[PDB]
Design an enzyme around this catalytic site. Sequence first.
Site, PDB file in Angstrom:
ATOM      1  N   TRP A  50     -90.815  47.859 -23.516  1.00  0.00           N
ATOM      2  CA  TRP A  50     -90.102  48.384 -24.685  1.00  0.00           C
ATOM      3  C   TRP A  50     -88.579  48.256 -24.598  1.00  0.00           C
ATOM      4  O   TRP A  50     -87.917  48.197 -25.640  1.00  0.00           O
ATOM      5  CB  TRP A  50     -90.484  49.873 -24.905  1.00  0.00           C
ATOM      6  CG  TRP A  50     -89.930  50.723 -23.805  1.00  0.00           C
ATOM      7  CD1 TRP A  50     -90.465  50.891 -22.560  1.00  0.00           C
ATOM      8  CD2 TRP A  50     -88.677  51.425 -23.803  1.00  0.00           C
ATOM      9  NE1 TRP A  50     -89.642  51.666 -21.792  1.00  0.00           N
ATOM     10  CE2 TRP A  50     -88.535  52.003 -22.526  1.00  0.00           C
ATOM     11  CE3 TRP A  50     -87.668  51.627 -24.757  1.00  0.00           C
ATOM     12  CZ2 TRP A  50     -87.426  52.763 -22.175  1.00  0.00           C
ATOM     13  CZ3 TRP A  50     -86.570  52.381 -24.407  1.00  0.00           C
ATOM     14  CH2 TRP A  50     -86.457  52.942 -23.129  1.00  0.00           C
ATOM     15  N   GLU A 119    -101.022  32.685 -12.713  1.00  0.00           N
ATOM     16  CA  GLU A 119    -101.922  32.985 -11.600  1.00  0.00           C
ATOM     17  C   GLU A 119    -103.385  32.868 -12.041  1.00  0.00           C
ATOM     18  O   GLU A 119    -104.007  33.864 -12.389  1.00  0.00           O
ATOM     19  CB  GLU A 119    -101.578  34.353 -10.987  1.00  0.00           C
ATOM     20  CG  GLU A 119    -100.132  34.329 -10.476  1.00  0.00           C
ATOM     21  CD  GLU A 119     -99.751  35.446  -9.531  1.00  0.00           C
ATOM     22  OE1 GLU A 119    -100.599  36.304  -9.207  1.00  0.00           O
ATOM     23  OE2 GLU A 119     -98.577  35.454  -9.109  1.00  0.00           O
TER      24      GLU A 119
END
Length: 369
Positions: A50, A119
Amino acid sequence: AKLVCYFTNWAQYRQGEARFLPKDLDPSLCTHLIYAFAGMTNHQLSTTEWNDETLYQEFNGLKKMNPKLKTLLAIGGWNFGTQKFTDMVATANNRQTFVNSAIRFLRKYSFDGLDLDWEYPGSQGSPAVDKERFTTLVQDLANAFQQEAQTSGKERLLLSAAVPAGQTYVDAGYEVDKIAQNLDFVNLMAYDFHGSWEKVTGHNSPLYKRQEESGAAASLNVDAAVQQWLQKGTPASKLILGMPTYGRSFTLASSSDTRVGAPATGSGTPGPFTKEGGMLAYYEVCSWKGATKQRIQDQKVPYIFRDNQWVGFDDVESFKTKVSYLKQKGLGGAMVWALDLDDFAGFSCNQGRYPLIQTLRQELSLVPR
């Protein structure tokens, strides 16, 4: 030499002394600071917290105090998974959308480059076609960054990648000799070799094998990982050796067997600050009351135990040993995961602020004069 350090945008939520805030950033500690993590929305680079934009301003604001500092934004990470990368690299159209978004985003927020932390291509759900598509993505980015520098006259954006140490992931996803040509540097994740996903104790980041090991296990160490990446075509000057400022913990089956390789029943008890079973920050083990520290003679790294808890971690001495190693191999520097897991505020270990990362800086002869 480089000293590449990761900042994590969730460390701000830890409690007490462990809370990592902008004031804890040191502009001169590292040569390169990498912001973990950005994400992706409709194939375009995007924030994940945020207040990322606030933190970007502070992070890149460090460059006013140290104009030599370079910053990069990392995309991905373990928790991000693979699907969004897979979907983005699936077509030339989607890659172009991503690449152009990345240039705009990095320029808007004053980053010097992009670190790819998928990943991983070809594993964790990603199909085999993603090995070559990752190569293409790396080239697309490198070439577009080159073009943008030529057109804009701005210093070229950097491209790095965080890459795995284990052969299974390397061969499923990484055309090493091709991608290394297009990456400015390669951040080798020389850690997470062992952990509580295994049913016997083993060290997070051992330098060498243990005499008892054989087969694939004998390559689950830093030296083997470094040699793997070099032999498969990474120039030594581009290979940056990752260093962990955390350890991996186990609950022992018996407090009487505390050896490396002893039976374990699961993850170690979560730390009081990091609250994740199976790992502990350096500041959660460095001052462990009533514990017994030992060393794995073959592997050049410490472990520590207390009752039925066992933790393999890195200390000042093991960081020194690893820097001596990287210098002997002619590598480009060290990388460290992560700023917020060292004793960044000097509250725990009685070794001052950033005792582990300052060791890297010292041993690399990077102390500011």
